[PDB]
Amino acid sequence: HMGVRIENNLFYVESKNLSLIIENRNGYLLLKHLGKTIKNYKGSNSVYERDHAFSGNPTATNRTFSLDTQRQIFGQHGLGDFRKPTIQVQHSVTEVTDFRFVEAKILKGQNGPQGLPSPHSMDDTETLVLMLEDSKAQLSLTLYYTTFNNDATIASYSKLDNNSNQEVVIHKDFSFMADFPAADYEIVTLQGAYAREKTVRRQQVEQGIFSISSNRGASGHAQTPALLLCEQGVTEDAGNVFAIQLMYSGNFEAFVQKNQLNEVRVAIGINPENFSWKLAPEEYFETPVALVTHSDQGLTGISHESQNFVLKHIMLSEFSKKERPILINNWEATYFDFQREKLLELADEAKKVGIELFVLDDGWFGNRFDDNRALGDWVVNEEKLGGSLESLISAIHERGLQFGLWLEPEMISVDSDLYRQHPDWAIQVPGYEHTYSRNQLVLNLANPQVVEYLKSVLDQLLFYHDIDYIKWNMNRNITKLGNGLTYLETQMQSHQYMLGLYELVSYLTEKHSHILFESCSGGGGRNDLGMMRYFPQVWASDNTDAIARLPIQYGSSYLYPTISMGAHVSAVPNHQMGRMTPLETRGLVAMMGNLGYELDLTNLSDEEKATIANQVNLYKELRPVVQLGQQYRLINPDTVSNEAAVQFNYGNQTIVTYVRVLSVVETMETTLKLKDLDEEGLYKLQENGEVYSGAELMYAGLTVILSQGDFLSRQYIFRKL
């Protein structure tokens, strides 16, 4: 049985194959167990209470009880625990609180923080409600833990109520924390950089504090809101992993602290940097949702658990199991230099090769002839489009293609009518020059007038035009915070910006629910689970190099389903890397993702056109396997590997893609073994017609043969008989 149970002083939060067991000890909440299901928990792994030097106590006479040494589910500073705190509220002359458990409730079905992205499809869930109070400060903190009956994930968030007669200020308020017992641990995170997104990083947990964080106002290219605490020696196939993740797209921190006793604290939430939150009497603050996910089946186990939870409970139901259109995007194809003739000719070529959707990228609005002006001016450039957008769309529709359109609503150019009319709408500090980034500024979405304006302009665009798809961009990070009437309002504006964004995108995605919205932030600059609540695919990276895409796709699909992961076949030499790669390899690499095209089809040879038509035909066949199937990493593209290989299973279809980076000589061929087949199953390999048992493919494997050369690839396609 799954759900929530209250049994004497234990609370059991029971998801599928994952339990959190909390003990109420005289108002203090102790983490007894987080991990595989245990019923009738007795306490075999309880903390041994002893006098630990310099670890102090809530009472004078009992030296062996200390919040410095108890395992907890939230952290305070000032009561004897010196580990990093996760709740810290200023009230009167102090930022000491002492929240004590008073009452527990259980909810059933949907719930979550208002104004923030949270799980859906929650009918078969229960939520533990732990009501804590600080009687002196007259504050309440309420913790929520939600079970899921179909996934090894628990969701968490909290609400802080000010029940006092004075203003209070939240300084720290994370979404999840767990104290894990001293043991050897490794951590996996996804970091990297622009054009190197979601680089998989693994390291040993060491004494001290390790953290990843964004202070950019977006989660960022260089860190993902995820931290995987792993059993020493974890592999793809074996060992315990706990993934903590955050459904938030602004400033966040994830940290792991190893203290003086070798104990380990992990937490994730809103970054303390650039954050404070004023609460007037009777006001409350709810944190974004955190997730804790578990597998005992290594890193592939955690990928599957995380992907499944995302597909079922985050990504929009309307799209989570819907094959996504193969698109053409004109950006790398033309940049800003296009007009109607060029567009329809590209559309003609796209239709001939069987592409499904035509996306008009940057440059269609205002006087956007380059990237130095016009953001904020969402007026159609009818001169450039050679008539109305309506007439363009009709043209695209009549050629048999869906129509998509680029927006960047959060941004404003100094050189724009919007800025001329409302210069105060930009994020800025009185008496300081702007800081520029791609020669543009960020709109203050903490300003309700800004949100109202964007809802209006965009609702107008979407209702008056037959648009099938939106690409929602965001091309710089936030500087010069000073739009508040007070310092505290400025400290709130980064989170209020996010609330404004979510109000905006939840409104539009809900009001226009037939439209496929793809998120973007110079590629993967905001590829997190907050955005994926509303945008069921993401432009994974501006780097469209087939080879540079290998580690990027590795990371981008590590916790997120492949279906989310936009990938385009682009021109050579590649625009980012300056590299020639075979068209075959560009195709096979993009086909490990959500396939599209981004090159000038009108300038290709007849042969290159035929190749792309063949690629499109192939992917129409593989699309369900890739987008709806189960992903298995076989060879990981990292810093030292010269190879990449990824398998997908879906019913009677099994495919495997193999890529080799550098040509090798006098080196024995790799043996590549498949996973998760029926030993007794019979698998017919398309290329040679041979039938192999699943046992053979899994335990003997394929001798991988290639010619001489860099960046070569091949694909194996099997049908189970």
Ligand X SMILES: OC[C@H]1O[C@H](O[C@@H]2[C@@H](O)[C@H](O)O[C@H](CO)[C@@H]2O)[C@H](O)[C@@H](O)[C@H]1O
Ligand Y SMILES: OC[C@H]1O[C@H](O[C@@H]2[C@@H](O)[C@@H](O)O[C@H](CO)[C@@H]2O)[C@H](O)[C@@H](O)[C@H]1O
Catalytic center residues: 528, 608
Amino acid identity, position 77: H
CA pair distance 199, 229, nearest whole angstrom: 17
Q: Is 561 in the site for ligand X (CB under 6 A)?
A: no
Q: Give 412's strand partners.
A: 441
**Tokens 């929602």, residue located:** 472
Q: How many residues bind ligand X (CB under 6 A)?
A: 13
Spatial CB neighbours of 611, under 8 Å, sequence gap ≥ 6: 583, 584, 587
CA pair distance 654, 681, nearest whole angstrom: 12
Identify which of residues 221 and 312 has a Cβ nearer to a second copy in the complex. Answer: 221
Look at residue 161 and give the partner it binds from ligand Y, a second copy, ligand X, none, a contact being a CB closer than 5 to 8 Å depending on partner kind: ligand Y
Q: Is 639 in the site for a second copy (CB under 8 A)?
A: yes
For residues 304 and 310, is the Cβ–Cβ distance under 8 A?
no
Identify which of residues 580 and 610 has a Cβ nearer to a second copy in the complex. Answer: 580
Question: Considering only residues 159, 304, 471, 633, which one is a binding residue for ligand Y as defined by CB under 6 A?
Answer: 159
**Tokens standing for residue 149:** 């009956």
Q: Is 677 in the site for ligand X (CB under 6 A)?
A: no
What's the min distance (Å) between Cβ of 590 and ligand Y? 47
Identify which of residues 279 and 481 has a Cβ nearer to ligand Y in the complex. Answer: 279
Q: Which stretch binds ligand X (CB under 6 A): 88-96, 274-282, 502-510, 516-524?
A: 516-524
What's the min distance (Å) between Cβ of 282 and ligand Y? 8
Identify which of residues 23 and 408 has a Cβ nearer to ligand X in the complex. Answer: 408
CA pair distance 18, 33, nearest whole angstrom: 10
What's the min distance (Å) between Cβ of 502 and ligand Y? 19
Amino acid identity, position 125: T
Look at residue 331 and give the partner it binds from ligand X, a second copy, ligand Y, none, a contact being a CB closer than 5 to 8 Å depending on partner kind: ligand X
Query: C-alpha distances in angstroms, 347 versus 19, 518, 597, 608?
Result: 53, 20, 12, 16
Q: Is 203 in the site for a second copy (CB under 8 A)?
A: no
Query: C-alpha distances in angstroms, 658 versus 95, 130, 702?
Result: 56, 50, 11
Look at residue 131 and give the partner it binds from ligand Y, a second copy, ligand X, none, a contact being a CB closer than 5 to 8 Å depending on partner kind: ligand Y
For residues 397 and 403, is the Cβ–Cβ distance under 8 A?
yes
Q: What does the CA dihedral 551, 555, 557, 559 come to, rounded to 10 degrees?
A: 160
Identify which of residues 15 and 223 has a Cβ nearer to a second copy in the complex. Answer: 223
Which of 25, 85, 73, 293 shows the shortest CA–CA distance to 178?
73
Q: Is 410 in the site for ligand X (CB under 6 A)?
A: no
Identify which of residues 156 and 219 has a Cβ nearer to ligand X in the complex. Answer: 219
Question: Considering only residues 142, 224, 447, 657, which one is a binding residue for ligand Y as defined by CB under 6 A?
Answer: 142
Look at residue 665 and give the partner it binds from a second copy, ligand Y, ligand X, none, a contact being a CB closer than 5 to 8 Å depending on partner kind: a second copy
**Tokens standing for residue 211:** 């953290």
What's the min distance (Å) between Cβ of 192 and a second copy? 9
Q: DSSP string covering 426-463, please?
A: B---TTSPPPPBTTBEEB-TTSHHHHHHHHHHHHHHHH
* Pairing mode, strands 702-703 and 3-7: unpaired
Which of 34, 39, 33 shows the shortest CA–CA distance to 2?
39
Identify which of residues 195 and 292 has a Cβ nearer to ligand X in the complex. Answer: 195
CA pair distance 141, 85, nearest whole angstrom: 14
Identify which of residues 547 and 565 has a Cβ nearer to a second copy in the complex. Answer: 547
Q: What does the CA dihedral 214, 217, 221, 224 come to, rounded to 10 degrees?
A: 50
Judged by CB under 6 A, the chain residues 265 through 294 that form the site for ligand Y are 284
CA pair distance 363, 332, nearest whole angstrom: 12
Look at residue 539 and give the partner it binds from a second copy, ligand Y, ligand X, none, a contact being a CB closer than 5 to 8 Å depending on partner kind: ligand X
Look at residue 208 and give the partner it binds from ligand X, a second copy, ligand Y, none, a contact being a CB closer than 5 to 8 Å depending on partner kind: none
Q: Please state the separation of Cα 366 from the chain's center in Å.
A: 32
- Could you give the string, one character per residue 296-335, with x where binding to ligand X holds by CB under 6 A and - elsewhere? -----------------------------------x----
Q: Is 543 in the site for a second copy (CB under 8 A)?
A: yes
* Angle between helix 583-590 and helix 606-628 axes, rounded to 10 deg: 20
What are the phi and psi torsion angles at 346 (to 5°)?
-60, -45
Q: Is 163 in the site for ligand Y (CB under 6 A)?
A: yes
Look at residue 708 and give the partner it binds from ligand X, a second copy, ligand Y, none, a contact being a CB closer than 5 to 8 Å depending on partner kind: a second copy
For residues 268 and 287, is the Cβ–Cβ distance under 8 A?
no
Identify which of residues 140 and 191 has a Cβ nearer to a second copy in the complex. Answer: 191
Identify which of residues 83 and 549 has a Cβ nearer to a second copy in the complex. Answer: 549
Q: 233: alpha, beta or left, given left = phi > 0 and alpha = psi -120 to 50? A: left
Alpha helices in 353-442 (DSSP H): 389-398, 417-421
What's the min distance (Å) between Cβ of 105 and ligand Y? 8
CA pair distance 378, 394, nearest whole angstrom: 20
CA pair distance 362, 377, nearest whole angstrom: 12
Q: Which stretch binds a second copy (CB under 8 A): 334-342, 376-384, 623-631, 663-671?
A: 663-671
Query: C-alpha distances in angstroms, 674 versus 623, 631, 671?
Result: 20, 11, 10
Question: Considering only residues 576, 627, 631, 636, which one is a binding residue for a second copy as defined by CB under 8 A?
Answer: 576
- Could you give the string, one character per residue 461-490, with x where binding to a second copy holds by CB under 8 A and - elsewhere? ------------------------------
Q: Is 161 in the site for ligand Y (CB under 6 A)?
A: yes
Identify which of residues 214 and 276 has a Cβ nearer to ligand X in the complex. Answer: 214
Which of 287, 319, 220, 199 shows the shortest CA–CA distance to 561?
319
Look at residue 473 and give the partner it binds from ligand X, ligand Y, a second copy, none, a contact being a CB closer than 5 to 8 Å depending on partner kind: ligand X
What are the phi and psi torsion angles at 68 (to 5°)?
-70, -20
Q: What is the DSSP letter of 287?
A: P
Question: Considering only residues 14, 68, 361, 377, which one is a binding residue for ligand X as defined by CB under 6 A?
Answer: 361
- Could you give the string, one character per residue 683-712, with x where binding to a second copy holds by CB under 8 A and - elsewhere? ------------------------xxxx--
Q: Which stretch binds ligand X (CB under 6 A): 140-148, 157-165, 182-190, 518-526?
A: 518-526
For residue 261, count CB atoms less than 10 angstroms from its CB and return exposed for 0-12, middle for 13-18, buried for 19 or more: exposed
- Could you give the string, one character per residue 449-488, with x where binding to ligand X holds by CB under 6 A and - elsewhere? ------------------------x-x-------------
CA pair distance 7, 27, nearest whole angstrom: 16
Number of H helices, E strands in the chain: 12, 38
Question: Considering only residues 605, 667, 680, 688, which one is a binding residue for a second copy as defined by CB under 8 A?
Answer: 667
Q: How many residues bind a second copy (CB under 8 A)?
A: 25
**Tokens standing for residue 368:** 């956007």
Q: Is 131 in the site for ligand Y (CB under 6 A)?
A: yes
Q: Which residues bind ligand X (CB under 6 A)?
A: 331, 361-362, 371, 406, 438, 473, 475, 520, 522-523, 539, 542
Binding site for a second copy (CB under 8 A): 193-196, 543, 547-548, 573, 576-580, 639-640, 661-663, 665-667, 707-710
Question: Which residues contribute to the site for ligand Y (CB under 6 A)?
Answer: 131, 140, 142, 159, 161, 163, 284
